[PDB]
Amino acid sequence: KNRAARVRVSKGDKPVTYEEAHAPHYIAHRKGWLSLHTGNLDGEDHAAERTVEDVFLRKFMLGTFPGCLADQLVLKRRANQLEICALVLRQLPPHKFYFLVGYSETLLSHFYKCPVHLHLQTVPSKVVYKYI
Amino acid sequence: SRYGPEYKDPQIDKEYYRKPLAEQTEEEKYERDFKKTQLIKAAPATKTSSVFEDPVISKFTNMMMKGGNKVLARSLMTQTLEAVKRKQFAKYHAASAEEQATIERNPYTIFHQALKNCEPVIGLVPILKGGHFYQVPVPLADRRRRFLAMKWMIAECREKKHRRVLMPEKLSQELLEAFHNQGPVIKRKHDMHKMAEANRALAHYRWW
Amino acid sequence: HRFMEPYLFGSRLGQDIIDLEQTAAHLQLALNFTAHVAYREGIILFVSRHRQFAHLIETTARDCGEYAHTRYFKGGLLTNAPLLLGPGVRLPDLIIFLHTLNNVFEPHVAVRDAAKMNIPTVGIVDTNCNPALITYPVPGNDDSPPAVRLFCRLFQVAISRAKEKRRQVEALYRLQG
Amino acid sequence: TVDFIKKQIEEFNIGKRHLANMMGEDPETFTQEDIDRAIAYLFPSGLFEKRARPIMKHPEEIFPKQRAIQWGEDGRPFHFLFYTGKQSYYSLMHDTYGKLLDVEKHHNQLRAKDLLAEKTKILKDPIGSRWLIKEELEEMLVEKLSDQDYAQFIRLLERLSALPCGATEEDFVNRFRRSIPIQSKKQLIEPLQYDEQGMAFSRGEGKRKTAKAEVVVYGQGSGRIDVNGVDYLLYFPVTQDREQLMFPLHFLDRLGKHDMTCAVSGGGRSAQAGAVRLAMARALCSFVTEDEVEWMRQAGLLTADPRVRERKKPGQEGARRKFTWKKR
RNA sequence: CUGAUG
RNA sequence: GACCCAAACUGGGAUUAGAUACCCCACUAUGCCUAGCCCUAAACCCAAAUAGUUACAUAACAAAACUAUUCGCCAGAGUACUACUCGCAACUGCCUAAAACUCAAAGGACUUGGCGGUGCUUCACAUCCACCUAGAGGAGCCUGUUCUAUAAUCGAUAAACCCCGAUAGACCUUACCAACCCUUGCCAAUUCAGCCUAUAUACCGCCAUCUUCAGCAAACCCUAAAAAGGAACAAUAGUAAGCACAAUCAUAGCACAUAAAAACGUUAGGUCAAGGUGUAGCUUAUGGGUUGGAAAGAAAUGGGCUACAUUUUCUACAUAA
RNA sequence: GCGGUCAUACGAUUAACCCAAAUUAAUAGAUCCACGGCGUAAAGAGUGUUUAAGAAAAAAAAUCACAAUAGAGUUAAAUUA
RNA sequence: ACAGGUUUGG
Ligand SMILES: [Mg+2]
Ligand SMILES: [Mg+2]
Ligand SMILES: [Mg+2]
Ligand SMILES: [Mg+2]
Ligand SMILES: [Mg+2]
Ligand SMILES: [Mg+2]
Ligand SMILES: [Mg+2]
Ligand SMILES: [Mg+2]
Ligand SMILES: [Mg+2]
Ligand SMILES: [Mg+2]
Ligand SMILES: [Mg+2]
Ligand SMILES: [Mg+2]
Ligand SMILES: [Mg+2]
Ligand SMILES: [Mg+2]
Ligand SMILES: [Mg+2]
Ligand SMILES: [Mg+2]
Ligand SMILES: [Mg+2]
Ligand SMILES: [Mg+2]
Ligand SMILES: [Mg+2]
Ligand SMILES: [Mg+2]
Ligand SMILES: [Mg+2]
Ligand SMILES: [Mg+2]
Ligand SMILES: [Mg+2]
Ligand SMILES: [Mg+2]
Ligand SMILES: [Mg+2]
Ligand SMILES: [Mg+2]
Ligand SMILES: [Mg+2]
Ligand SMILES: [Mg+2]
Ligand SMILES: [Mg+2]
Ligand SMILES: [Mg+2]
Ligand SMILES: [Mg+2]
Ligand SMILES: [Mg+2]
Ligand SMILES: [Mg+2]
Ligand SMILES: [Mg+2]
Ligand SMILES: [Mg+2]
Ligand SMILES: [Mg+2]
Ligand SMILES: [Mg+2]
Ligand SMILES: [Mg+2]
Ligand SMILES: [Mg+2]
Ligand SMILES: [Mg+2]
Ligand SMILES: [Mg+2]
Ligand SMILES: [Mg+2]
Ligand SMILES: [Mg+2]
Ligand SMILES: [Mg+2]
Ligand SMILES: [Mg+2]
């Protein structure tokens, strides 16, 4: 049985997000990609650099915003400046949210030698799509 | 398989469409054949509206075709027909005036007559009864009879010939032998009939 | 039915004859009860599984302004009402049975579900019916067209008179103060 | 959820005004064909499923038909068939039966008075009328439906349509009728073109097994074919491919009556022969009357050949041939 | 017809 | 005494590994008559006899539940239609009928699955047969396994392993071996690093198979109790969110087809060696580096390529030489 | 019934529970089987009559086509010397 | 006896 990127159905009480409720065979059909760059085109290069940078951003933000991240990050890459769109729970005060965004906006820039943008959309709770 | 079940078989006969006003029973069918939005399949590349082709010759060429060498199968068929034509012309010009009115030089008629001559009447079916297979004599269908008549000739002319002899050269001889009721294919049909006559008493084992 | 012997007058050459003295004595109480429940703003449901007068019973309940069920009675209609009808539903305060047996000649489902849900039931019972669970049985005929029409018109006029006397009593209620 | 939809309609009207403002069109003439057009530009989501794209419509198409309230503040239900489970479907059946009995009694009285003023208004074949499907009835009746009750309602509708129809009965039975697309597979015939003082000039396009063929036909010349600049005899050395060329012409008896020039590319010899066969057959329709082009399509000249090589599957050999499966 | 065992 | 016919036993013939059985043939005791014994049966309608009642009331199934007067029996199962007594024309017999010892059960009825070389309908569309084509098992070679042989990996190894991890081995890869060196030894620090050590019978992550089978299932409701089941469309207790199926999507137009998908679970199925890991074990070593070797085939076998020719081979060439 | 690699069941330690100048083990006892059952679990004895013994508690009845049984005589179909 | 444990997938 297929088990990749597939949350198994429980008795009917688990909350799942729109990205988790769809199997990987639905990518580009019902759901899209969490990252957008040019390295995955036909005659382009420098793809593995973007893959490892993306996975580093994921593993870094998972630790930077612990327990308060709603879903996965959206890594947009457009003209030398990399934007990170996040959905965050309103567990931390804005006084700490601004400290964290200002810290990461410069740490990632000085680590990757490129301008970064960080945008946070705060939600009251994890959005439920299927049964809850 | 790409054609759905609604696709009907095409009709290649031009004389069927050239004169529809000659009969009324066909009018009621061909005026509604198109009204029900009935889709028609594409005509195959093998079957066309030529008058010099025959479905029996097409079937024999398809049965002689190895793999996908249809040009080779067509060459063998054409060379076989040419060989039987020249072999009949030689005897026409070597016989007297009394046999000239009886000898036939048309290759299609002698091909069809040889096939009808080697066409079996009844066949054998293996029926398991009492843990042993009995060869029960069964009436064959028309397509099965014609297929066996072609297959016996092809299987004989493919293996029972010399390496120096070619396929049309052997088939031209066996066609005339089957037309004159002398060939081993006719002998094989007679062996089938004799085995069926020896197991005629086992015809009660059939349930259809 | 074995429980029809006390409600019978005799047997006229095979066919049982229901006495009419006890019929009227039961019908008076049945009509009084249905008129009182229609006076006290009670939901009345005319139930009957018989494919001859179903249209007559729907039209009678429509002219009465009460509710009707002449179709296939679902399983958990009265018991599993907060799931069959809606989140919060008011069960009928009276069930009037114009045919006790269904098309299979077995006792209806509502004749047991009303007794399970403590709902009063008035019912027209024939010689082959079971009145053990019916609150107000009326021994009569439920297979002749005029016999059905007589009961339907009696209950029609009873509900009409009850609602009209209720409106008149409220009219005097508005003049008492 | 009666108030939620009411609020969504106000928010959708405000969103429509804002959309017309940011798109720069007059909000008065702003319609749905401009709403979806502006959404497709502002939020260009590339997805294969059309229902996953961003969409902004009136809330009555997005949200399904919500059931109205069934009882008042005192608990008494509104409809008299509320305790039947399907108070809409059973009410529809009750009204249909009540009109059937009215037609029956009126026709009995009319037969008693010996008058026949009704006609047969059930045969709606030239109009193209059909009955409602279960989904179409589930759209009218908000509650769910089944198969047996829908077949019972249709069987009662035909019973009502089999009787002498009245005045108000026909408009009631009509609202359950649906008009069926065009039931005509007749192809479009290209008109005869005249280009550069050339008479009887037509063109056709064919494709079979990765072979594209465009064939121009001049109906004033003699019988000969010019493909890729070289004659058909040297282009198709095999007699079968030339017999494919003879197939469409021998069917119309126009062998020595038309000159043709073809341009075929892709595929092999028999694929090119079939593509030029289909292109010549589609191009010969202009020179012939309507009765014979139908015989061409019934003989297989005007229809394509969808038989395309299937893709090889992983773990197999030829998309059907499996590996040698060892039992032990 | 026949044809055992785990 | 009789003996047409049937038939224990027996002798031949079939079938089978065996057939001192089922199947076929012949024939004997016997079944038949008279007289005398034997006194046993699923001798069961598993329901004692005599007079009744339809009151209370369904453990289950079955032949519905019970009264009053009696008689004959019943005290866990096996031992046990047994041993020893008595009696009997019975002497391989019948009747009556224990104990030692072993166990914590033995039993009757039912529910749900599974199975059936049980009856009956509907099916198989590359699927069982009736039928078609091309192959394997024969030869050489390539390659993977099992075996012998070395100091010289490992895992897979019924369908669901066998050109499988590997879309890939001269050093490296390589986790194997022999010789040699280093032991807070990749990291900012850590009585710390590191382990391809054991456990896939602790796992996650990924899959195989039933499987293009349709079922799984939360919340309720009903059953003269409920282990469980829940349906009659002229409808008899069933509503059911959800996951599956279906639909849609993709192979740039439809339809078809293909692809994709295929839930809950079965096989403690495969994977500690993609990666991390719970538990138990190494720490001057089961850890980290350098050099050199990891053969070979007595043999068997799986899958492929080449053919064994004449519809063949070579040459120029689209296929008329 | 527990023990084959996290044993609250084995041995030891901590802790806890119940008794207590007593606590456990073994053996004897007291108590405990049926005023219950006999179609399927053990039980209606293969059948009828009679003796002993018991109940007679309110009144009624006895006996009819057809294959009971024991003797004597006969044979329609089939089969056979 | 105011009883409890124990037959079986149940
Ligand atoms: Mg009645
Ligand atoms: Mg192939
Ligand atoms: Mg004898
Ligand atoms: Mg004999
Ligand atoms: Mg023998
Ligand atoms: Mg007997
Ligand atoms: Mg007995
Ligand atoms: Mg007795
Ligand atoms: Mg029961
Ligand atoms: Mg004992
Ligand atoms: Mg005995
Ligand atoms: Mg004995
Ligand atoms: Mg096969
Ligand atoms: Mg081969
Ligand atoms: Mg070989
Ligand atoms: Mg190995
Ligand atoms: Mg192994
Ligand atoms: Mg296996
Ligand atoms: Mg090395
Ligand atoms: Mg190496
Ligand atoms: Mg190591
Ligand atoms: Mg496993
Ligand atoms: Mg289903
Ligand atoms: Mg249940
Ligand atoms: Mg559901
Ligand atoms: Mg499409
Ligand atoms: Mg489809
Ligand atoms: Mg697939
Ligand atoms: Mg699907
Ligand atoms: Mg295992
Ligand atoms: Mg293993
Ligand atoms: Mg590891
Ligand atoms: Mg290991
Ligand atoms: Mg080998
Ligand atoms: Mg393979
Ligand atoms: Mg321990
Ligand atoms: Mg203990
Ligand atoms: Mg202990
Ligand atoms: Mg007892
Ligand atoms: Mg017994
Ligand atoms: Mg007895
Ligand atoms: Mg006995
Ligand atoms: Mg005698
Ligand atoms: Mg004699
Ligand atoms: Mg037991």
Coordinates of N, CA and C in Angstrom, one line a residue, chain D residues 65 67 86 88-93 96 130-157 172-178:
Chain D
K65 N -28.0 24.0 -1.5 CA -29.3 24.4 -1.1 C -29.6 24.0 0.4
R67 N -31.8 23.6 3.8 CA -33.2 23.3 4.1 C -33.7 24.5 4.9
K86 N -39.7 12.8 4.0 CA -39.5 13.5 2.8 C -40.7 14.3 2.5
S88 N -41.0 17.2 1.0 CA -41.1 17.7 -0.3 C -41.4 16.7 -1.4
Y89 N -40.8 15.6 -1.3 CA -41.1 14.5 -2.3 C -42.5 14.0 -2.2
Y90 N -42.9 13.7 -0.9 CA -44.2 13.1 -0.7 C -45.3 14.1 -1.0
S91 N -45.0 15.4 -0.8 CA -46.0 16.4 -1.2 C -46.1 16.6 -2.7
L92 N -45.0 16.4 -3.4 CA -45.0 16.4 -4.9 C -45.8 15.2 -5.4
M93 N -45.6 14.1 -4.8 CA -46.4 12.9 -5.2 C -47.9 13.0 -4.9
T96 N -49.3 15.4 -7.5 CA -49.5 14.7 -8.7 C -50.7 13.7 -8.7
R130 N -37.2 15.2 -22.6 CA -36.9 14.0 -21.8 C -37.3 14.3 -20.3
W131 N -37.2 13.3 -19.5 CA -37.6 13.4 -18.1 C -36.4 13.8 -17.3
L132 N -36.7 14.3 -16.0 CA -35.7 14.7 -15.1 C -34.9 13.5 -14.6
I133 N -33.6 13.8 -14.4 CA -32.7 12.8 -13.8 C -32.8 12.9 -12.3
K134 N -32.2 11.9 -11.6 CA -32.3 12.0 -10.1 C -31.5 13.2 -9.6
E135 N -30.4 13.6 -10.2 CA -29.7 14.8 -9.7 C -30.5 16.0 -10.0
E136 N -31.2 16.1 -11.1 CA -32.0 17.2 -11.4 C -33.2 17.3 -10.5
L137 N -33.7 16.2 -10.0 CA -34.8 16.2 -9.0 C -34.3 16.5 -7.6
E138 N -33.1 16.1 -7.3 CA -32.5 16.5 -6.0 C -32.1 17.9 -6.0
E139 N -32.0 18.6 -7.1 CA -31.8 20.0 -7.1 C -33.0 20.8 -6.9
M140 N -34.2 20.3 -7.4 CA -35.5 20.9 -7.1 C -35.9 20.7 -5.7
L141 N -36.0 19.4 -5.3 CA -36.3 19.1 -3.9 C -35.0 19.1 -3.1
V142 N -34.9 19.9 -2.1 CA -33.7 20.1 -1.4 C -33.3 18.8 -0.7
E143 N -34.2 18.1 -0.2 CA -33.9 16.8 0.5 C -33.4 15.8 -0.5
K144 N -32.7 14.8 0.1 CA -32.1 13.7 -0.7 C -33.2 12.8 -1.3
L145 N -32.9 12.1 -2.4 CA -33.8 11.2 -3.1 C -33.1 9.8 -3.2
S146 N -33.9 8.9 -3.6 CA -33.5 7.5 -3.9 C -33.8 7.1 -5.3
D147 N -33.7 5.8 -5.6 CA -34.0 5.3 -7.0 C -35.4 4.9 -7.1
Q148 N -35.9 4.2 -6.1 CA -37.3 3.6 -6.3 C -38.3 4.7 -6.3
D149 N -38.2 5.7 -5.4 CA -39.2 6.7 -5.4 C -39.1 7.6 -6.6
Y150 N -37.9 7.8 -7.2 CA -37.8 8.6 -8.4 C -38.4 7.8 -9.6
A151 N -38.2 6.5 -9.6 CA -38.9 5.7 -10.6 C -40.4 5.6 -10.5
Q152 N -40.9 5.7 -9.2 CA -42.3 5.7 -8.9 C -42.9 7.1 -9.4
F153 N -42.1 8.2 -9.2 CA -42.6 9.5 -9.6 C -42.6 9.6 -11.1
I154 N -41.6 9.0 -11.8 CA -41.6 9.0 -13.3 C -42.8 8.1 -13.8
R155 N -43.0 7.0 -13.2 CA -44.1 6.1 -13.6 C -45.4 6.7 -13.3
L156 N -45.5 7.6 -12.3 CA -46.8 8.3 -12.1 C -46.9 9.5 -13.1
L157 N -45.8 10.1 -13.5 CA -45.8 11.2 -14.5 C -46.3 10.6 -15.9
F172 N -47.8 22.0 -15.6 CA -47.2 21.4 -14.5 C -46.3 20.2 -14.9
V173 N -46.7 19.4 -15.9 CA -45.9 18.3 -16.3 C -44.8 18.8 -17.2
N174 N -44.8 20.0 -17.8 CA -43.7 20.5 -18.6 C -42.5 20.8 -17.7
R175 N -42.7 21.3 -16.5 CA -41.6 21.7 -15.7 C -40.7 20.6 -15.2
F176 N -41.1 19.3 -15.5 CA -40.2 18.2 -15.2 C -39.6 17.7 -16.5
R177 N -39.6 18.5 -17.6 CA -39.1 18.1 -18.9 C -37.8 18.9 -19.2
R178 N -36.8 18.2 -19.8 CA -35.6 18.8 -20.2 C -35.4 18.6 -21.7

